[PDB]
Design an enzyme around this catalytic site. Structure first.
Site, PDB file in Angstrom:
ATOM      1  N   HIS C  52       0.948  -1.153  -0.042  1.00  0.00           N
ATOM      2  CA  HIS C  52       0.112  -0.049  -0.178  1.00  0.00           C
ATOM      3  C   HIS C  52       0.936   1.400  -0.112  1.00  0.00           C
ATOM      4  O   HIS C  52       1.970   1.036   0.591  1.00  0.00           O
ATOM      5  CB  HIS C  52      -0.900   0.168   1.013  1.00  0.00           C
ATOM      6  CG  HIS C  52      -1.717  -1.172   1.579  1.00  0.00           C
ATOM      7  ND1 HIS C  52      -1.252  -2.166   1.988  1.00  0.00           N
ATOM      8  CD2 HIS C  52      -3.047  -1.025   1.341  1.00  0.00           C
ATOM      9  CE1 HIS C  52      -2.293  -3.131   2.265  1.00  0.00           C
ATOM     10  NE2 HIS C  52      -3.565  -2.346   1.540  1.00  0.00           N
ATOM     11  N   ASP C  55       2.327   1.952   3.279  1.00  0.00           N
ATOM     12  CA  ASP C  55       3.247   0.913   3.769  1.00  0.00           C
ATOM     13  C   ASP C  55       4.625   1.500   3.473  1.00  0.00           C
ATOM     14  O   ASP C  55       5.689   1.158   4.289  1.00  0.00           O
ATOM     15  CB  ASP C  55       3.184  -0.512   3.109  1.00  0.00           C
ATOM     16  CG  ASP C  55       1.821  -0.990   3.741  1.00  0.00           C
ATOM     17  OD1 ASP C  55       1.301  -1.024   4.625  1.00  0.00           O
ATOM     18  OD2 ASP C  55       1.353  -1.804   2.761  1.00  0.00           O
ATOM     19  N   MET C  86       2.581  -5.832  -7.932  1.00  0.00           N
ATOM     20  CA  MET C  86       1.132  -5.321  -7.531  1.00  0.00           C
ATOM     21  C   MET C  86       1.410  -4.416  -6.501  1.00  0.00           C
ATOM     22  O   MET C  86       2.294  -4.433  -5.625  1.00  0.00           O
ATOM     23  CB  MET C  86       0.265  -6.418  -6.805  1.00  0.00           C
ATOM     24  CG  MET C  86      -1.026  -5.903  -6.308  1.00  0.00           C
ATOM     25  SD  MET C  86      -1.244  -5.465  -4.865  1.00  0.00           S
ATOM     26  CE  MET C  86      -1.243  -6.961  -4.041  1.00  0.00           C
ATOM     27  N   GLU C 179     -10.778  -6.355  -4.923  1.00  0.00           N
ATOM     28  CA  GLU C 179     -10.804  -7.302  -3.781  1.00  0.00           C
ATOM     29  C   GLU C 179     -12.023  -7.425  -2.881  1.00  0.00           C
ATOM     30  O   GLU C 179     -12.086  -6.318  -2.329  1.00  0.00           O
ATOM     31  CB  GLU C 179      -9.467  -7.389  -2.944  1.00  0.00           C
ATOM     32  CG  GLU C 179      -9.323  -8.196  -2.058  1.00  0.00           C
ATOM     33  CD  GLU C 179      -8.234  -8.074  -1.136  1.00  0.00           C
ATOM     34  OE1 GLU C 179      -7.260  -7.631  -1.634  1.00  0.00           O
ATOM     35  OE2 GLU C 179      -8.356  -8.437  -0.133  1.00  0.00           O
ATOM     36  N   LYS C 181     -14.583  -8.583   0.112  1.00  0.00           N
ATOM     37  CA  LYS C 181     -14.578  -8.888   1.379  1.00  0.00           C
ATOM     38  C   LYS C 181     -16.108  -8.799   2.056  1.00  0.00           C
ATOM     39  O   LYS C 181     -16.478  -7.626   1.570  1.00  0.00           O
ATOM     40  CB  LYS C 181     -13.717  -8.405   2.495  1.00  0.00           C
ATOM     41  CG  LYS C 181     -13.547  -9.017   3.688  1.00  0.00           C
ATOM     42  CD  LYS C 181     -12.531  -7.955   4.623  1.00  0.00           C
ATOM     43  CE  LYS C 181     -12.282  -8.816   5.893  1.00  0.00           C
ATOM     44  NZ  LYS C 181     -11.211  -8.125   6.537  1.00  0.00           N
ATOM     45  N   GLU C 215      -9.383 -13.421  -2.238  1.00  0.00           N
ATOM     46  CA  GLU C 215      -8.660 -13.856  -1.008  1.00  0.00           C
ATOM     47  C   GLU C 215      -9.252 -15.033  -0.379  1.00  0.00           C
ATOM     48  O   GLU C 215     -10.468 -15.073  -0.163  1.00  0.00           O
ATOM     49  CB  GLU C 215      -8.438 -12.570  -0.020  1.00  0.00           C
ATOM     50  CG  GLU C 215      -7.509 -13.243   1.146  1.00  0.00           C
ATOM     51  CD  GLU C 215      -7.333 -12.213   2.304  1.00  0.00           C
ATOM     52  OE1 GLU C 215      -6.745 -11.219   2.130  1.00  0.00           O
ATOM     53  OE2 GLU C 215      -7.907 -12.815   3.533  1.00  0.00           O
ATOM     54  N   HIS C 218     -11.306 -14.359   2.825  1.00  0.00           N
ATOM     55  CA  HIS C 218     -12.454 -13.467   2.470  1.00  0.00           C
ATOM     56  C   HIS C 218     -13.653 -14.065   2.223  1.00  0.00           C
ATOM     57  O   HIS C 218     -14.799 -13.991   2.914  1.00  0.00           O
ATOM     58  CB  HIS C 218     -12.293 -12.319   1.660  1.00  0.00           C
ATOM     59  CG  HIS C 218     -11.294 -11.210   2.491  1.00  0.00           C
ATOM     60  ND1 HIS C 218     -10.725 -10.181   1.458  1.00  0.00           N
ATOM     61  CD2 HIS C 218     -10.630 -11.309   3.433  1.00  0.00           C
ATOM     62  CE1 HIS C 218      -9.975  -9.438   2.237  1.00  0.00           C
ATOM     63  NE2 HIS C 218      -9.981 -10.126   3.446  1.00  0.00           N
ATOM     64  N   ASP C 243      -4.994 -13.490  -3.568  1.00  0.00           N
ATOM     65  CA  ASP C 243      -4.290 -13.430  -2.205  1.00  0.00           C
ATOM     66  C   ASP C 243      -4.572 -14.832  -1.396  1.00  0.00           C
ATOM     67  O   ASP C 243      -5.833 -15.469  -1.285  1.00  0.00           O
ATOM     68  CB  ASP C 243      -4.775 -12.469  -1.380  1.00  0.00           C
ATOM     69  CG  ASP C 243      -4.624 -11.042  -1.902  1.00  0.00           C
ATOM     70  OD1 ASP C 243      -3.562 -11.018  -2.659  1.00  0.00           O
ATOM     71  OD2 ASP C 243      -5.076  -9.996  -1.265  1.00  0.00           O
ATOM     72  N   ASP C 253     -11.605 -12.147  10.385  1.00  0.00           N
ATOM     73  CA  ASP C 253     -10.435 -12.233   9.233  1.00  0.00           C
ATOM     74  C   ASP C 253      -9.066 -12.651  10.018  1.00  0.00           C
ATOM     75  O   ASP C 253      -8.552 -11.835  10.605  1.00  0.00           O
ATOM     76  CB  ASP C 253     -10.399 -11.103   8.636  1.00  0.00           C
ATOM     77  CG  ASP C 253      -9.543 -11.025   7.230  1.00  0.00           C
ATOM     78  OD1 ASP C 253      -9.279 -12.417   6.726  1.00  0.00           O
ATOM     79  OD2 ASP C 253      -8.803 -10.152   6.814  1.00  0.00           O
ATOM     80  N   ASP C 255      -6.471 -14.425   8.585  1.00  0.00           N
ATOM     81  CA  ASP C 255      -5.117 -14.267   8.016  1.00  0.00           C
ATOM     82  C   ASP C 255      -4.023 -15.158   8.534  1.00  0.00           C
ATOM     83  O   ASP C 255      -2.691 -14.670   8.407  1.00  0.00           O
ATOM     84  CB  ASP C 255      -4.755 -12.681   8.014  1.00  0.00           C
ATOM     85  CG  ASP C 255      -5.366 -11.718   7.193  1.00  0.00           C
ATOM     86  OD1 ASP C 255      -5.834 -12.111   5.962  1.00  0.00           O
ATOM     87  OD2 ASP C 255      -5.357 -10.652   7.391  1.00  0.00           O
ATOM     88  N   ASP C 285      -1.198 -12.799   1.430  1.00  0.00           N
ATOM     89  CA  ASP C 285      -1.836 -11.958   2.335  1.00  0.00           C
ATOM     90  C   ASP C 285      -2.098 -12.501   3.753  1.00  0.00           C
ATOM     91  O   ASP C 285      -3.077 -13.022   3.841  1.00  0.00           O
ATOM     92  CB  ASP C 285      -3.001 -10.888   1.577  1.00  0.00           C
ATOM     93  CG  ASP C 285      -3.346  -9.719   2.666  1.00  0.00           C
ATOM     94  OD1 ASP C 285      -2.820  -9.678   3.619  1.00  0.00           O
ATOM     95  OD2 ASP C 285      -4.051  -8.858   2.222  1.00  0.00           O
TER      96      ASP C 285
HETATM   97 MG   LIG Z   1      -6.058  -9.398   0.960  1.00  0.00          MG
HETATM   98 MN   LIG Z   2      -7.731 -11.018   5.128  1.00  0.00          MN
END
Ligand SMILES: [Mg+2]
Ligand SMILES: [Mn+2]
Ligand code: PRO
Ligand code: PRO
Ligand code: PRO
Ligand code: PRO
Ligand SMILES: [Mg+2]
Ligand SMILES: [Mg+2]
Ligand SMILES: [Mg+2]
Ligand SMILES: [Mn+2]
Ligand SMILES: [Mn+2]
Ligand SMILES: [Mn+2]
Lengths: 385, 385, 385, 385
Positions: C52, C55, C86, C179, C181, C215, C218, C243, C253, C255, C285
């Protein structure tokens, strides 16, 4: 990974005998004679079978018909060496149980439910069952005003206490196992999880006579961790029986063969049962999918046992691996098993290392090393060591 | 629907004081001085407030700073007439608790968790709290090998037994309330539901000292029926405290204001609490959404109380309506409250009306009339009578 | 199972760089310099990294600070051979985005969101990114009146159309990937699944410029089958990026590292990506759990890649096994791939074998043999062949 | 709140005609003659009825039997003034459809499914239906290798394209509506949500002929926001029909009467349908619970309509209230409806107020006032204004 009767694998008559009827579908398979099921299961290496009263003796049978059904079943057990470690009552299929058995609003239905149960307890004892399961699938509600839950629990306790009084009066050695499920067929079912069932048992007159019969899929229908629930049941000394199958999360009760659904939860379950020394039946309550013919039925049943045995091997290898043993120490699983304060309350209060001089930052900085441990577990499960 | 202190509505400091940080977001509101929160809540008609140790006294405070924080808070209570009926410990925020407090794998962390708790029990008693809540939000695991659950429950029992020994030794009247949650922040949390917590309490040395503090949203995160769980807690005599909020089903813990989320479950909850005569605080553990400014914070808090009072009115009207009373009899809720077999086991066995001469078809044909009853409930809730 | 850059494994800066803050917890790890993350990931055999805007360049950076951040990052890429396939925009962390970026009720916020995005598109192109992801995590609502969804979709289309106009105007080759979610951090998020995103893309001015970035976790938060959703994306020619991670069903979520969570879904996903010839990055991710120190961070990252490679091997072995190939024919997977009616409508209408003389009972009796096929898949996955 | 035919309320024959069979239960009610259902529904104020082929004409009927079934049904419609706005095919009950209709692995089954559908399209047109629904309840899988989803979507497109060619060839005005469901009876069903169905339609040869028929309970089985999905369908111009009922979150398909389940979602749904000017049937696909006798069946059906009308009144009052209109402006719902950048891309790029001179902190500080708006909505719903 070939099962033998020593592995204690058992199956319900209603499992391999499921004709494939579902809420949107007619039967896809012909009915099975219990005699044939016993023979086919024995050939696969099963240890035994279980039954609801109405699986073995068609509802409404005369005494002569009943006697013949039992005689043929007895002969099948004798022909194969199969055992019957558990039996149960059907208090859900017949429309009379539409609002429940033990907690039906109608008192006459509650009394009938008890009589139907007692009749089958006698038969279960005759056939050698050590555990009598109760799944209250119709106990519950779709709407809030339909069921006063405190009143329903009063009735549920009354029913289980009477059953306990009955087995005591007959000198039977059989014990009860309450099977929780959170929903389906009722919108919400009473005693929806292992925890609720365990708590309820503590209020019974003779709690020592009652344990739980948890099912993989049932706890997973509430999104709960099944190995965690089984651990709490073991901790309480109440894992009297267990039902093994597979489930993909939160949806209708799938009853997939064991190993299907959440594979890693199956691994951790087997790891726990074997480590704890669970000595009861490894019972499968599953349904071969209605897509299958009879060859597929027996394949699915065989797969239940195969997957248990593969997971058993991998869990044992995991626990025996010196690298895993080192990782467990690295993650302080050994410390988890040591008492927090065997020195006692006053000693803890007086211990400056527990507060005044506890370096919280140093403790916080210590990694748990859980990911490395878990990848060792993954590698063992997949045979990638 | 204007609340007054007589309604016993309470709020956590961390509720209206939530700054809006979430897993993907920075704060949207400035921090609130607990003194201002007490004043604003009192103005809205609240009865009192609750706190974690670290909400009231910033972690790492010196004794002089601690004294001043408490002094100012005490003055705010005195200025407003607000009470503090419950307090609790933060055993989840600081990184030292990353694997738990009472069930951390690290023994030094477990001992610290107990000392931190004991310190705040003393403060809670000083401020007049009758209930001490324990939410073990960090007790659990993300992976199977990280936490042996039997060992963890041994440690959890050790911790709660020590706390019981402590309160007994001081002659404090305070009781404990264990707050279940199924997951978040851990992948699975130990004692995930009201049932699991109730069962665990039965294995404590002094079970009479411990009850549950269930939260609407928490049980709903497992898809469970919250009024049913509350009924089982009441049945067991263990509803020591309750947390009210809203939740839309199975997802992250939303902490919406009470009334939001599952509105009909809120109705049935209020109906149950009022019918049963629950006499404890009506505590809100909610978060005004981070979209809101401070005006929205107080609006959201006011809405919690308003919705409780509206639902109270409608539930009372429902139960008092002669048409509903007739419908309840039509659905045999009266029969549900009558013992199944006060005549005893032998009488039941000898009663041909319970089996041999029970007309199952006639019983089955009797409709439960639950839909008419439920539409009366709907009509009352919506003010469409 | 050692990864090399040829395997195309990529990681977000925010993955291994996650400090461990959660809704109930402070950071458990220090921040990572993106330069160190690039070096450590390269050492593990990664192909590249993603970011991002915020980031890589701390929000609010001056032009000189921005230039230096990019310069150092560029040097790290050059030192390691890492790529940046990406990039994406942070339209969720800053409180200004509390009601969304592209669909914020405030028009000034929507315009700012677009400008912030456009700035980072330029940077992404400079660093060589081929795909630009958009996760609208703040687009949605907690309450019904707060967001008119038709109006919000109008604004969402306006935003994506403008971005398409922008890339076209600059002659950039970069494409967009939306993306989905379903929820978290908003109570409900707009475009909640792969299906909703695919449908939305069809209404854009230049649909060819947009695909999906699904993802694992997600889609699983909606209880959906991730391999099925990926199949529909592939069918539509829209799987522009993916992802990879793990998730245990319907909850917050998680992850988890790829392979964790639903292991069998991971197997079927890898089987599909490899069979279909997906040629994009295998992007992770995930978040190393906050229990971990930095050694655990890199272990968790390594495990992502290892599990992909193990599953790749097992899926390939499954598809190549003559016994499996025979089972696939037995289950008529070959017939599934043949057109139903290449003969055309009139021919079908005139074909008595399709109705008048179709033996439905004979067809119904044919078992699908799916259980045997699935146990072959299980055996391959577990290395029990 | 008395319904009349002008309200366009319709019911499936299979709704009030459900005999109460469930996965664990036998029938609790006798079968209903469609003639009686039409009469009873008309008496309650319904506008019409819908049917699967096999609801109206028992499977396997001769041409003479078929003619008589239709004749009697036609007479009932004529006697009552009831209409038939929608019809559909049963491609799920008969065991031949155990692996699907249009996407069965067996090609002969796919062809039969198409012929069965075409036959009933002719009948639907004869009886005046404007919409033909397709619910692919058997399209999907329990295991990963059983169904190649890309191949299945190829077959699904082939089937729908052929149906489109058929209606075009006959000059029929009828349009198709695809009904999504995420699971049950298959472990995962293809096109599981409104989004997936919308996306699929875009790949059909004549997309203008196809829309969606979403069901409240179905989207809620994936935990999705039903009003949001309906909004996206409306946005796409594809809400051809709708099925109304109630569902308590993520579990088996409950089919409660409309208004039950998620009451607030029902409110927001009605608000949306009425605001948007949805002009199609308000169709109920529900099941009176099996606890009920026939009196309860008609009570449950009446409640569907009553709850729609109560919610209609309250939503209209909400939108018309000047205080709510002020609150909507306070929350910038008006701004949400204004284009983000009608000035165009270059103007946005050149607008310093959109970035260089955008005061992000001032924007961030502006509360959304969503909680006050939502409590006004709550007050309207409950009649507490
Ligand atoms: Mg993601
Ligand atoms: Mn996630
Ligand atoms: O035999 C059993 O099943 C139990 C398990 C723990 C030890 N004894
Ligand atoms: O006072 C209370 O809270 C409990 C509730 C049931 C009766 N006593
Ligand atoms: O290269 C890719 O990613 C796509 C996948 C299907 C064929 N081409
Ligand atoms: O008539 C209908 O149903 C659609 C709804 C939006 C406008 N036209
Ligand atoms: Mg079972
Ligand atoms: Mg709480
Ligand atoms: Mg429907
Ligand atoms: Mn089951
Ligand atoms: Mn909460
Ligand atoms: Mn349905």
């Amino acid at each position: 990974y070939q099962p033998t009767p020593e592995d204690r694998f058992t199956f319900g008559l209603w499992t391999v005998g499921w004709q494939g009827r579902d809420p949107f579908g007619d039967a896809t398979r012909r009915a099975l004679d219990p005699v044939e099921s016993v023979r086919r299961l024995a050939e696969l290496g099963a240890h035994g079978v279980t039954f609801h009263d109405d699986d073995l003796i068609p509802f409404g049978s005369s005494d002569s018909e009943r006697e013949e059904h039992v005689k043929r079943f007895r002969q099948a057990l004798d022909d194969t060496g199969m055992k019957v470690p558990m039996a149960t009552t059907n208090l859900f299929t017949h429309p009379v149980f539409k609002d429940g058995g033990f907690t039906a609003n109608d008192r006459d239905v509650r009394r009938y439910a008890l009589r139907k149960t007692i009749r089958n307890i006698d038969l279960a004892v005759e056939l050698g069952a050590e555990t009598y399961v109760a799944w209250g699938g119709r106990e519950g509600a779709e709407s809030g005003g339909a069921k006063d839950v405190r009143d329903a629990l009063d009735r549920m306790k009354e029913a289980f206490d009477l059953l306990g009084e009955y087995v005591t009066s007959q000198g039977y050695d059989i014990r009860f196992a309450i099977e929780p499920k959170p929903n389906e067929p009722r919108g919400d079912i009473l005693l929806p999880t292992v925890g609720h069932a365990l708590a309820f048992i503590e209020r019974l007159e003779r709690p020592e006579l009652y344990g739980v019969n948890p099912e993989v899929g049932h706890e997973q229908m509430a999104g709960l961790n099944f190995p965690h629930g089984i651990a709490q049941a073991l901790w309480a000394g109440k894992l009297f029986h267990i039902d093994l199958n597979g489930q993909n999360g939160i949806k209708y009760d799938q009853d997939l063969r064991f190993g299907a659904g959440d594979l890693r939860a199956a691994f951790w379950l087997v790891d726990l049962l074997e480590s704890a020394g669970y000595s009861g039946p490894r019972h499968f309550d599953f349904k071969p999918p209605r897509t299958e013919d009879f060859d597929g039925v027996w394949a699915s049943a065989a797969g239940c046992m195969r997957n248990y045995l593969i997971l058993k091997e991998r869990a044992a290898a995991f626990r025996a691996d010196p690298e895993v043993q080192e990782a467990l120490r690295a993650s302080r699983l050994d410390e988890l098993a040591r008492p927090t304060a065997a020195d006692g309350l006053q000693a803890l209060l007086d211990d400056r290392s527990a507060f005044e001089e506890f370096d919280v930052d140093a403790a916080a900085a210590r990694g748990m090393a859980f990911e490395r441990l878990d990848q060792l577990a993954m590698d063992h499960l997949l045979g990638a060591r």
